[PDB]
Write an enzyme that holds these catalytic residues in place. Structure first.
Site, PDB file in Angstrom:
ATOM      1  NE  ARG A   1      -3.763   0.189   0.164  1.00 60.63           N
ATOM      2  CZ  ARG A   1      -4.564  -0.113  -0.853  1.00 60.63           C
ATOM      3  NH1 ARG A   1      -4.523   0.604  -1.968  1.00 60.63           N
ATOM      4  NH2 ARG A   1      -5.405  -1.134  -0.756  1.00 60.63           N
ATOM      5  NE  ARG A   2       1.817   2.660  -6.050  1.00 58.84           N
ATOM      6  CZ  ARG A   2       3.037   2.555  -6.567  1.00 58.84           C
ATOM      7  NH1 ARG A   2       4.020   3.322  -6.114  1.00 58.84           N
ATOM      8  NH2 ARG A   2       3.276   1.683  -7.537  1.00 58.84           N
TER       9      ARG A   2
ATOM     10  CD  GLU B   1       1.265  -4.130  -7.801  1.00 58.26           C
ATOM     11  OE1 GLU B   1       1.308  -4.329  -6.569  1.00 58.26           O
ATOM     12  OE2 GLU B   1       1.942  -3.250  -8.371  1.00 58.26           O
TER      13      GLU B   1
END
Lengths: 312, 480
Positions: A190-191, A254
């Site tokens: 998670r960014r 992803e």
């Protein structure tokens, strides 16, 4: 007797704090100013460092001779007989020879980090500690350790500027006798919460020789090219993957691509409880069955060893 | 202005006498907390407290309190150790570092091994940050011992204040280390530990100082391969493209000795180092242009390097930062040159002379009617006799600028078989001889029949090493 100029040389050419402090105290107890230590990056010198060097080594009379000619360190490292005699007004050959002695003392104590590719100055110093003055003679001609077996004497005389034939013969003999010879691990994260953990995983896996990739044209092909897969489960990592049937999140893409491949998924849990299968899409429910590895900040090395033991 | 010193000197005299008097556990830590609180009150005065804090640190040094802190860092307790460490973190100024480097090395080096509590580590990282700024000898004594290992282990943590001290310690060690210090850092892979420090989306000052340390390690030519294999350069160029120097100008001043360290970032022909140097000199040029000290950039000479960055740009970010840095100063910004140098007429040559610092010879080229085709084919004798450039050092500066020009040139109007890319694949300083070989009628299909005299007289290659390399390459790979 002349110990003052030697103390000035000790201050301007110091690598030890004790002798420099004693020389500064000795020049302070006398009636002259103490000099400053020179910047060792001589190819990074501009004009004012050259002027300070002249004021420290005793060439003040030619200071206005170098400011009008705009001489920096790159021109100071590449100065010869004729430019001293004609352009600089240094007509006396004995004054020129004193300048070349000071230039020898300068080019011995010099940082060539901005130009030396293959560490030629340490080889020249291992031959003889008076050879490093020719380092700029050989670096500026495009030479390194892999070319000196094809250099002649004329190339050292005209281009490199080695005036002593004994040093030319020694450098030629030494150069002819001893110098003649898809990623693997992809990390999803998670960014906003799992950036530092993913970066730390990438660093501790690249310390062990693993080619690790980070950050529909490139990411899916990066999953296809990677042999393994590491999932970072931060608090809120699977938050945007809940009810994502429209295929909008990148982490969703992803995870769906990694479960379409069938790679070895190793989840990394850092204070994140296990979610439910019904709030997630079905094709990404299979990540809830893999054996994840918890993260310990105090015992990170054994955790990275546990990660390496669960990979190919 | 001067009465704050009269308020703060006898209070610290009484406090240091109480620290000398106390020998317990809680009273010693309370006295250290009182001294540290008075120092914190000394930091926060608007444009007054800098010299006040320097004078108070000098008074602590002259009272023998530095040796008192060196003895209290040897204490077997834990609380008074972290208070003395956090006090010594803020006492270290430009005059205390000599006394700490003479005696205090070995005691702080002993606390570099004790790493588990955060209250020690957050301050010992800052003390090592200050101690990497002293000299190259102190950097060798810290890196050769277990001082670098403490910072490289403390890069693993998540403390947003500790990692700032770690990034600044690695940056100041890369600035003031030398050759062997950088070799020992990169053989221990210190550039790889800066990857969580350049990517962490919580602090941006921390990422800027991490990219500074990466760029300063990337300015060494024996180092760039393992730095490119590390992968921390690729985070530099977007981040500099994402931030603004006017916002970070308040957090980032430094003296002229540290201003001299940002100039070889620009003249080291690497994109990330030039972006870091342009961003930092733009922010600190805004700093020095808010005040009246703009003569420092002309004394050190970063202005001509920024002009070279504008006139030789292939990146928009470093060119925009260099134009903004020259706009915040008091000179005009230059224009980007036209890369088609064989397509130049006289006015492009005049503009090139006005941009690279050869204005005095501008009227020397207009009367002689020199265009780009004559500029690419100019020698010693025509400079000496026809152009009035009698000084050989001025001629050599002109040939350095001609090297920089003929490196960045578009030869599309004359190159038939793409010879410039072959010369660049041999060595990126060979493309300056491209016009030497194209104008003689040569291409890739003829260089196997060229001798050394044809490269000397016709092509004008004055270095025999480059002649031997070009002949050897043309006979080994262009023979087919």
């Amino acid at each position: 007797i002349g110990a003052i100029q030697s103390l000035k040389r000790l201050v301007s050419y110091s690598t030890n704090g004790t002798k420099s402090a004693l020389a500064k105290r000795a020049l302070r107890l006398l009636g002259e100013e103490v000099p400053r230590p020179i910047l060792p990056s001589v190819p990074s010198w501009k004009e004012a460092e050259v002027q300070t060097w002249l004021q420290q080594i005793g060439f003040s009379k030619y200071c206005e001779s170098f400011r009008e000619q705009q001489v920096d360190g790159d021109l100071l490292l590449r100065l010869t007989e004729e430019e001293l005699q004609t352009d600089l007004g240094m007509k006396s050959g004995i004054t020129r020879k004193r300048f070349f002695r000071e230039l020898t003392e300068l080019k011995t104590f010099a940082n060539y980090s901005t130009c030396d590719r293959s560490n030629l100055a340490d080889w020249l110093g291992s031959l003889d500690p008076r050879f490093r003055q020719y380092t700029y003679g050989l670096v500026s001609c495009g030479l390194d350790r892999s070319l000196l077996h094809r250099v002649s004497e004329q190339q050292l005389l005209e281009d490199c500027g080695i005036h002593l034939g004994v040093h030319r013969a020694r450098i030629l003999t030494a150069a002819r006798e001893m110098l003649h010879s898809t990623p693997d691990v992809f990390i999803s994260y998670r960014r906003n919460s799992g950036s530092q953990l993913a970066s730390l995983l990438k660093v501790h896996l690249q310390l062990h020789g693993f080619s690790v990739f980070i950050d529909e044209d490139k990411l899916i092909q990066s999953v296809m090219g990677a042999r393994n897969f590491v999932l970072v489960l931060s608090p809120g990592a699977l938050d945007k993957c809940m009810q994502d049937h429209d295929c909008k999140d990148w982490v969703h893409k992803e995870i769906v691509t990694a479960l379409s491949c069938g790679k070895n998924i190793v989840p990394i849990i850092d204070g994140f409880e296990w979610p439910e299968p019904q709030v997630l899409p079905e094709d990404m429910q299979a990540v809830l069955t893999f054996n994840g590895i918890k993260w310990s900040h105090e015992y990170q090395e054994a955790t990275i060893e546990k990660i390496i033991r669960f990979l190919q | 202005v001067q009465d704050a010193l009269e308020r703060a000197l006898p209070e610290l005299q009484q406090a240091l006498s109480a620290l000398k008097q106390a020998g317990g556990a809680r009273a010693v830590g309370a006295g250290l907390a009182e001294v540290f609180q008075l120092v914190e009150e000394a930091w926060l005065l608007p444009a007054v407290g800098r010299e006040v804090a320097q004078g108070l640190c000098d008074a602590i040094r002259l009272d023998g309190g530095l040796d008192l802190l060196l003895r209290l860092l040897q204490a077997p307790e834990l609380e008074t150790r972290v208070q003395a460490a956090r006090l010594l973190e803020q006492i270290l100024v430009a005059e205390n570092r000599d006394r700490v480097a003479r005696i205090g090395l070995g005691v702080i080096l002993n606390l570099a091994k004790e790493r588990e509590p955060v209250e020690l580590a957050r301050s010992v990282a800052g003390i090592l940050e200050h101690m990497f700024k002293h000299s190259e000898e102190t950097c060798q004594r810290l890196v050769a011992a277990g001082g670098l290992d403490a910072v490289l282990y403390w890069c693993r943590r998540t403390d947003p204040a500790l990692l700032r001290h770690c990034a600044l310690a690695l940056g100041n060690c890369a600035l003031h280390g030398g050759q062997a210090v950088q070799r020992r850092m990169v053989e221990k892979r210190a550039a790889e530990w800066l990857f969580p420090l350049a990517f962490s989306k919580e602090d941006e000052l921390l990422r800027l100082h991490a990219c500074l340390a990466v760029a300063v390690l990337a300015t060494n030519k024996e180092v760039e391969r393992e730095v490119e294999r590390s992968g921390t350069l690729a985070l530099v160029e977007p981040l500099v493209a994402s931030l603004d120097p006017g916002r970070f100008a308040r957090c980032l001043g430094r003296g002229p000795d540290d201003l001299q360290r940002l100039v070889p970032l620009l003249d080291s022909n690497r994109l990330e180092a030039q972006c870091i140097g342009a961003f930092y000199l733009c922010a600190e040029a805004a700093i020095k242009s808010l005040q009246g000290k703009t003569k420092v950039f002309s004394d050190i000479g970063a202005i001509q390097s920024l002009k070279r960055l504008v006139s030789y740009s292939t990146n928009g970010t470093k060119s925009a930062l260099a134009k903004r840095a020259l706009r915040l100063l008091g000179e005009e910004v230059p224009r980007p040159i036209l890369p088609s140098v064989p397509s130049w007429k006289e006015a492009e040559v005049q503009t090139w002379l006005q941009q690279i610092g050869f204005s005095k010879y501008c009227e020397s080229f207009r009367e002689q009617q020199v265009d780009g085709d004559l500029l690419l084919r100019l020698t010693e004798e025509e400079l000496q006799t026809d152009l009035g450039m009698k000084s050989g050092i001025t001629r050599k500066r002109f040939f350095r600028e001609l090297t920089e020009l003929k490196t960045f040139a578009n030869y599309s109007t004359c190159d038939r078989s793409n010879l410039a890319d072959w010369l660049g694949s041999l060595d990126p300083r060979f493309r300056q001889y491209t016009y030497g070989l194209v104008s003689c009628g040569l291409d890739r299909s003829l260089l196997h029949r060229v001798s050394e005299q044809q490269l000397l007289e016709d092509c004008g290659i004055h270095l025999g090493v480059h002649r031997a390399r070009i002949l050897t390459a043309a006979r080994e790979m262009l023979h087919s």
